[PDB]
Amino acid sequence: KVFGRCELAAAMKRFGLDNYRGYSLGNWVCAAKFESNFNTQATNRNTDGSTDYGILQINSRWWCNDGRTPGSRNLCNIPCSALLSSDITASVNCAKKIVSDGNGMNAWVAWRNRCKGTDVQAWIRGCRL
């Protein structure tokens, strides 16, 4: 499922990401945008053999199990395929664990490189929230 900008914003708001750990909603929408382009089914393999899954591109080396990442930790306790679902609940729950791991949203390279320090409020403009 490819989310619409305001549609994703509302879903994230509903799940309680607005200002979660200090990060306003525009931050989360921006991360999703550059990580997966709002597509729940996005996958990206990394050089070390792990793969990123879903709208937030959660990595298999630590957070989920894809059965093909020797040394994976599966901290969110979920098969990676669950992050590809049209229902973003699993992704949101896992992301909440990730962002609380101590490095905040820097865990998402796209966020750090393209969202950090930008006017992230622009991402939720025009949306009824």
Short mmCIF file of N, CA and C in Angstrom, two decimals:
data_model
loop_
_atom_site.label_atom_id
_atom_site.label_comp_id
_atom_site.label_asym_id
_atom_site.label_seq_id
_atom_site.Cartn_x
_atom_site.Cartn_y
_atom_site.Cartn_z
N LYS A 1 0.87 -1.21 0.00
CA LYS A 1 0.00 0.00 0.00
C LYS A 1 0.89 1.24 0.00
N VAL A 2 0.61 2.17 -0.91
CA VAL A 2 1.39 3.40 -0.98
C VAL A 2 0.52 4.47 -0.33
N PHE A 3 0.96 4.98 0.81
CA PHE A 3 0.20 5.98 1.55
C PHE A 3 0.23 7.37 0.97
N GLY A 4 -0.86 8.10 1.23
CA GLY A 4 -0.94 9.48 0.82
C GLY A 4 -0.31 10.21 1.98
N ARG A 5 0.28 11.37 1.73
CA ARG A 5 0.94 12.14 2.79
C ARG A 5 0.07 12.39 4.04
N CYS A 6 -1.13 12.96 3.87
CA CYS A 6 -1.99 13.24 5.01
C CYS A 6 -2.58 11.98 5.61
N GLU A 7 -2.82 10.98 4.77
CA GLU A 7 -3.34 9.71 5.25
C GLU A 7 -2.33 9.05 6.21
N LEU A 8 -1.05 9.08 5.86
CA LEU A 8 -0.04 8.49 6.74
C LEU A 8 0.09 9.33 8.01
N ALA A 9 0.09 10.66 7.86
CA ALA A 9 0.20 11.57 9.00
C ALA A 9 -0.84 11.26 10.06
N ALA A 10 -2.09 11.06 9.62
CA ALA A 10 -3.21 10.77 10.51
C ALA A 10 -3.07 9.43 11.19
N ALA A 11 -2.56 8.45 10.45
CA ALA A 11 -2.37 7.11 11.00
C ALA A 11 -1.29 7.13 12.06
N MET A 12 -0.21 7.88 11.80
CA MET A 12 0.89 7.99 12.76
C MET A 12 0.42 8.76 14.00
N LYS A 13 -0.38 9.80 13.78
CA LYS A 13 -0.92 10.58 14.88
C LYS A 13 -1.76 9.65 15.74
N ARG A 14 -2.67 8.91 15.10
CA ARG A 14 -3.52 7.96 15.80
C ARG A 14 -2.72 6.94 16.62
N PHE A 15 -1.57 6.52 16.11
CA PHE A 15 -0.74 5.57 16.82
C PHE A 15 0.16 6.24 17.87
N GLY A 16 0.10 7.56 18.00
CA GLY A 16 0.87 8.22 19.02
C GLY A 16 2.32 8.54 18.77
N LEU A 17 2.64 8.88 17.53
CA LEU A 17 4.01 9.23 17.18
C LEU A 17 4.27 10.74 17.26
N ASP A 18 3.21 11.54 17.27
CA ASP A 18 3.41 12.98 17.34
C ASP A 18 4.10 13.32 18.66
N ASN A 19 5.32 13.82 18.55
CA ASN A 19 6.12 14.17 19.71
C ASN A 19 6.53 12.97 20.55
N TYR A 20 6.53 11.79 19.95
CA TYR A 20 6.97 10.61 20.67
C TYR A 20 8.48 10.80 20.83
N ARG A 21 8.93 10.74 22.07
CA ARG A 21 10.34 10.92 22.40
C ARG A 21 10.85 12.26 21.89
N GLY A 22 9.97 13.25 21.87
CA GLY A 22 10.38 14.56 21.41
C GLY A 22 10.35 14.82 19.92
N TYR A 23 9.99 13.83 19.10
CA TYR A 23 9.95 14.07 17.66
C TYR A 23 8.56 14.37 17.15
N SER A 24 8.37 15.57 16.63
CA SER A 24 7.09 15.97 16.11
C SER A 24 6.73 15.15 14.87
N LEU A 25 5.44 15.15 14.54
CA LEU A 25 4.91 14.40 13.42
C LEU A 25 5.59 14.62 12.07
N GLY A 26 5.97 15.85 11.78
CA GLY A 26 6.61 16.13 10.51
C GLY A 26 7.85 15.29 10.34
N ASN A 27 8.54 15.00 11.45
CA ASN A 27 9.76 14.18 11.42
C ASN A 27 9.52 12.75 10.91
N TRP A 28 8.48 12.13 11.44
CA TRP A 28 8.09 10.76 11.10
C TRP A 28 7.61 10.65 9.66
N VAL A 29 6.80 11.61 9.21
CA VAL A 29 6.28 11.63 7.83
C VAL A 29 7.46 11.81 6.84
N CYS A 30 8.41 12.68 7.19
CA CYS A 30 9.58 12.95 6.37
C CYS A 30 10.45 11.69 6.28
N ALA A 31 10.66 11.03 7.42
CA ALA A 31 11.47 9.81 7.42
C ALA A 31 10.85 8.75 6.49
N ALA A 32 9.54 8.56 6.62
CA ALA A 32 8.81 7.60 5.79
C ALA A 32 8.96 7.94 4.31
N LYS A 33 8.80 9.22 4.00
CA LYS A 33 8.92 9.71 2.65
C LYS A 33 10.24 9.31 2.00
N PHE A 34 11.36 9.66 2.63
CA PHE A 34 12.67 9.37 2.06
C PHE A 34 13.19 7.97 2.29
N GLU A 35 12.60 7.25 3.23
CA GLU A 35 13.02 5.89 3.48
C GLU A 35 12.35 4.95 2.49
N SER A 36 11.04 5.10 2.33
CA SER A 36 10.28 4.18 1.48
C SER A 36 9.40 4.83 0.45
N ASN A 37 9.34 6.16 0.46
CA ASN A 37 8.49 6.90 -0.46
C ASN A 37 7.02 6.53 -0.19
N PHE A 38 6.68 6.33 1.09
CA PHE A 38 5.32 6.00 1.56
C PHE A 38 4.80 4.60 1.16
N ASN A 39 5.71 3.68 0.85
CA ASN A 39 5.34 2.34 0.41
C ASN A 39 5.68 1.28 1.44
N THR A 40 4.62 0.66 1.97
CA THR A 40 4.73 -0.39 2.97
C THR A 40 5.50 -1.63 2.49
N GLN A 41 5.52 -1.85 1.18
CA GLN A 41 6.19 -3.04 0.64
C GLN A 41 7.63 -2.86 0.22
N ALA A 42 8.22 -1.70 0.48
CA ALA A 42 9.61 -1.47 0.11
C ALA A 42 10.62 -2.35 0.89
N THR A 43 11.60 -2.89 0.16
CA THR A 43 12.65 -3.71 0.75
C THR A 43 13.95 -3.21 0.12
N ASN A 44 15.03 -3.30 0.88
CA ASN A 44 16.34 -2.89 0.40
C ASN A 44 17.39 -3.72 1.10
N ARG A 45 18.19 -4.41 0.31
CA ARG A 45 19.23 -5.26 0.87
C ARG A 45 20.46 -4.41 1.13
N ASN A 46 21.15 -4.71 2.21
CA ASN A 46 22.36 -3.98 2.58
C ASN A 46 23.59 -4.83 2.29
N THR A 47 24.75 -4.19 2.19
CA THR A 47 25.99 -4.91 1.91
C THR A 47 26.33 -6.04 2.89
N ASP A 48 26.00 -5.86 4.17
CA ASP A 48 26.30 -6.89 5.15
C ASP A 48 25.35 -8.08 5.07
N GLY A 49 24.42 -8.07 4.13
CA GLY A 49 23.49 -9.18 4.01
C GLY A 49 22.12 -8.97 4.64
N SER A 50 21.98 -7.99 5.54
CA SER A 50 20.67 -7.73 6.16
C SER A 50 19.79 -6.98 5.16
N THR A 51 18.50 -6.86 5.45
CA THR A 51 17.56 -6.19 4.53
C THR A 51 16.71 -5.23 5.34
N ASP A 52 16.30 -4.12 4.73
CA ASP A 52 15.44 -3.15 5.40
C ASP A 52 14.01 -3.41 4.93
N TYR A 53 13.05 -3.33 5.84
CA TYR A 53 11.68 -3.63 5.47
C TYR A 53 10.66 -2.55 5.79
N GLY A 54 9.72 -2.37 4.87
CA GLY A 54 8.60 -1.47 5.07
C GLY A 54 8.73 0.02 4.92
N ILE A 55 7.67 0.67 5.38
CA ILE A 55 7.56 2.11 5.30
C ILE A 55 8.67 2.85 6.05
N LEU A 56 9.22 2.25 7.10
CA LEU A 56 10.29 2.88 7.86
C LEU A 56 11.64 2.20 7.66
N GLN A 57 11.68 1.22 6.76
CA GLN A 57 12.91 0.52 6.42
C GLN A 57 13.68 -0.03 7.63
N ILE A 58 12.98 -0.81 8.43
CA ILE A 58 13.54 -1.40 9.62
C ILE A 58 14.46 -2.58 9.23
N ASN A 59 15.67 -2.56 9.79
CA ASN A 59 16.70 -3.53 9.48
C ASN A 59 16.56 -4.87 10.16
N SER A 60 16.84 -5.94 9.41
CA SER A 60 16.75 -7.32 9.91
C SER A 60 17.89 -7.76 10.84
N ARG A 61 19.02 -7.06 10.83
CA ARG A 61 20.14 -7.44 11.71
C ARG A 61 19.84 -7.31 13.22
N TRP A 62 18.92 -6.42 13.58
CA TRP A 62 18.58 -6.18 14.98
C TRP A 62 17.12 -6.31 15.39
N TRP A 63 16.24 -5.77 14.56
CA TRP A 63 14.82 -5.68 14.88
C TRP A 63 13.84 -6.75 14.45
N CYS A 64 14.12 -7.47 13.38
CA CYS A 64 13.16 -8.47 12.95
C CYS A 64 13.83 -9.70 12.41
N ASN A 65 13.03 -10.73 12.19
CA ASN A 65 13.56 -11.98 11.69
C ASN A 65 13.07 -12.29 10.29
N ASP A 66 14.03 -12.43 9.38
CA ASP A 66 13.69 -12.75 8.02
C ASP A 66 14.24 -14.12 7.62
N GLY A 67 14.84 -14.81 8.58
CA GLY A 67 15.34 -16.15 8.33
C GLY A 67 16.53 -16.24 7.42
N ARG A 68 17.20 -15.12 7.17
CA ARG A 68 18.36 -15.13 6.28
C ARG A 68 19.40 -14.08 6.66
N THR A 69 19.51 -13.80 7.95
CA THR A 69 20.46 -12.81 8.45
C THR A 69 21.19 -13.39 9.66
N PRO A 70 22.19 -14.24 9.41
CA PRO A 70 22.99 -14.88 10.45
C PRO A 70 23.49 -13.86 11.46
N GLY A 71 22.99 -13.96 12.69
CA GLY A 71 23.39 -13.02 13.73
C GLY A 71 22.34 -11.97 14.04
N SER A 72 21.21 -12.02 13.35
CA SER A 72 20.11 -11.09 13.58
C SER A 72 19.70 -11.19 15.06
N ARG A 73 19.21 -10.09 15.63
CA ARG A 73 18.78 -10.10 17.03
C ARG A 73 17.25 -10.15 17.26
N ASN A 74 16.46 -9.78 16.25
CA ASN A 74 14.99 -9.77 16.37
C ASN A 74 14.41 -9.13 17.65
N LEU A 75 14.81 -7.90 17.93
CA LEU A 75 14.38 -7.17 19.12
C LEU A 75 12.91 -6.77 19.18
N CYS A 76 12.25 -6.64 18.03
CA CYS A 76 10.84 -6.28 18.05
C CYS A 76 9.99 -7.54 18.07
N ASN A 77 10.66 -8.69 18.01
CA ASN A 77 10.01 -10.00 18.02
C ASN A 77 8.92 -10.15 16.99
N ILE A 78 9.30 -10.03 15.73
CA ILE A 78 8.34 -10.15 14.64
C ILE A 78 9.03 -10.62 13.37
N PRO A 79 8.31 -11.36 12.50
CA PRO A 79 8.97 -11.77 11.25
C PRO A 79 8.98 -10.46 10.43
N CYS A 80 10.04 -10.24 9.68
CA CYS A 80 10.14 -9.01 8.90
C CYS A 80 8.99 -8.76 7.93
N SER A 81 8.39 -9.83 7.41
CA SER A 81 7.28 -9.70 6.48
C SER A 81 6.11 -8.90 7.08
N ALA A 82 6.03 -8.88 8.41
CA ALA A 82 4.96 -8.17 9.12
C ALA A 82 5.04 -6.65 8.95
N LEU A 83 6.23 -6.17 8.64
CA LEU A 83 6.49 -4.74 8.43
C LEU A 83 6.08 -4.28 7.03
N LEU A 84 5.68 -5.22 6.19
CA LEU A 84 5.28 -4.92 4.82
C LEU A 84 3.76 -4.79 4.66
N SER A 85 3.04 -5.17 5.71
CA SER A 85 1.59 -5.12 5.73
C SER A 85 1.02 -3.71 5.47
N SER A 86 -0.21 -3.65 4.98
CA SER A 86 -0.86 -2.39 4.73
C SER A 86 -1.28 -1.71 6.04
N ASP A 87 -1.23 -2.47 7.13
CA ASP A 87 -1.55 -2.01 8.47
C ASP A 87 -0.17 -1.73 9.09
N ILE A 88 0.11 -0.46 9.33
CA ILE A 88 1.42 -0.08 9.85
C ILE A 88 1.64 -0.23 11.34
N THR A 89 0.72 -0.89 12.04
CA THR A 89 0.86 -1.05 13.49
C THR A 89 2.19 -1.67 13.93
N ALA A 90 2.57 -2.79 13.33
CA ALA A 90 3.83 -3.43 13.68
C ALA A 90 5.01 -2.52 13.44
N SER A 91 5.02 -1.82 12.31
CA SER A 91 6.12 -0.91 11.98
C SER A 91 6.20 0.22 13.02
N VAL A 92 5.06 0.80 13.34
CA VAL A 92 5.03 1.88 14.33
C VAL A 92 5.52 1.41 15.71
N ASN A 93 5.09 0.23 16.12
CA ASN A 93 5.48 -0.30 17.42
C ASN A 93 6.98 -0.55 17.48
N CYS A 94 7.49 -1.13 16.41
CA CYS A 94 8.91 -1.43 16.33
C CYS A 94 9.72 -0.14 16.27
N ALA A 95 9.27 0.84 15.49
CA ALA A 95 9.96 2.13 15.38
C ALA A 95 10.05 2.82 16.75
N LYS A 96 9.02 2.66 17.57
CA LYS A 96 9.01 3.26 18.91
C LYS A 96 10.12 2.66 19.76
N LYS A 97 10.40 1.38 19.55
CA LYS A 97 11.47 0.71 20.26
C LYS A 97 12.81 1.24 19.75
N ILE A 98 12.92 1.33 18.43
CA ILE A 98 14.13 1.81 17.79
C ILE A 98 14.51 3.23 18.26
N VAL A 99 13.58 4.18 18.12
CA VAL A 99 13.84 5.57 18.48
C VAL A 99 14.20 5.78 19.95
N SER A 100 13.87 4.80 20.79
CA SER A 100 14.16 4.85 22.21
C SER A 100 15.49 4.17 22.56
N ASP A 101 16.14 3.58 21.56
CA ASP A 101 17.41 2.86 21.73
C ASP A 101 18.61 3.73 22.11
N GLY A 102 18.40 5.04 22.23
CA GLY A 102 19.47 5.92 22.62
C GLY A 102 19.99 6.90 21.58
N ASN A 103 19.80 6.59 20.30
CA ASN A 103 20.28 7.49 19.25
C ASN A 103 19.19 8.26 18.56
N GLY A 104 17.99 8.16 19.11
CA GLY A 104 16.85 8.85 18.55
C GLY A 104 16.57 8.47 17.11
N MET A 105 16.21 9.47 16.31
CA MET A 105 15.90 9.21 14.91
C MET A 105 17.09 9.13 13.97
N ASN A 106 18.31 9.30 14.51
CA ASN A 106 19.55 9.20 13.72
C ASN A 106 19.73 7.76 13.23
N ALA A 107 18.94 6.85 13.82
CA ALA A 107 18.93 5.45 13.45
C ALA A 107 18.51 5.35 11.98
N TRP A 108 17.76 6.34 11.50
CA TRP A 108 17.31 6.38 10.11
C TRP A 108 18.20 7.33 9.35
N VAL A 109 19.09 6.77 8.53
CA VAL A 109 20.04 7.57 7.76
C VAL A 109 19.38 8.62 6.85
N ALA A 110 18.24 8.26 6.26
CA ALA A 110 17.55 9.21 5.39
C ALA A 110 17.07 10.40 6.20
N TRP A 111 16.60 10.14 7.42
CA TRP A 111 16.12 11.21 8.31
C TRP A 111 17.28 12.18 8.63
N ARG A 112 18.38 11.60 9.09
CA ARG A 112 19.57 12.34 9.46
C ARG A 112 20.07 13.19 8.30
N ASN A 113 20.11 12.59 7.12
CA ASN A 113 20.60 13.27 5.93
C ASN A 113 19.67 14.20 5.19
N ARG A 114 18.36 13.96 5.28
CA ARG A 114 17.42 14.77 4.53
C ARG A 114 16.30 15.45 5.31
N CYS A 115 16.09 15.03 6.56
CA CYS A 115 15.06 15.64 7.35
C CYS A 115 15.59 16.49 8.48
N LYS A 116 16.61 15.98 9.16
CA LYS A 116 17.21 16.65 10.30
C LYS A 116 17.55 18.13 10.02
N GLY A 117 17.02 19.00 10.86
CA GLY A 117 17.27 20.42 10.70
C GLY A 117 16.57 21.11 9.54
N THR A 118 15.58 20.46 8.95
CA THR A 118 14.87 21.09 7.86
C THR A 118 13.52 21.47 8.45
N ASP A 119 12.70 22.18 7.69
CA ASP A 119 11.38 22.56 8.17
C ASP A 119 10.47 21.35 8.00
N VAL A 120 10.53 20.43 8.94
CA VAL A 120 9.72 19.22 8.87
C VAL A 120 8.22 19.46 8.99
N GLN A 121 7.81 20.64 9.44
CA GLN A 121 6.38 20.94 9.57
C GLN A 121 5.70 20.97 8.21
N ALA A 122 6.48 21.25 7.17
CA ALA A 122 5.96 21.30 5.82
C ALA A 122 5.33 19.98 5.42
N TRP A 123 5.80 18.89 6.03
CA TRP A 123 5.29 17.55 5.73
C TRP A 123 3.87 17.28 6.21
N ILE A 124 3.38 18.05 7.17
CA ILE A 124 2.02 17.81 7.60
C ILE A 124 1.12 18.99 7.29
N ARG A 125 1.63 19.93 6.49
CA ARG A 125 0.83 21.09 6.11
C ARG A 125 -0.37 20.63 5.27
N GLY A 126 -1.49 21.35 5.39
CA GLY A 126 -2.67 21.02 4.63
C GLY A 126 -3.48 19.84 5.10
N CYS A 127 -2.98 19.11 6.09
CA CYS A 127 -3.68 17.94 6.59
C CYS A 127 -4.59 18.27 7.77
N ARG A 128 -5.78 17.66 7.81
CA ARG A 128 -6.67 17.86 8.95
C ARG A 128 -6.23 16.79 9.93
N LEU A 129 -5.65 17.19 11.06
CA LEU A 129 -5.17 16.21 12.03
C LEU A 129 -5.89 16.20 13.37
#
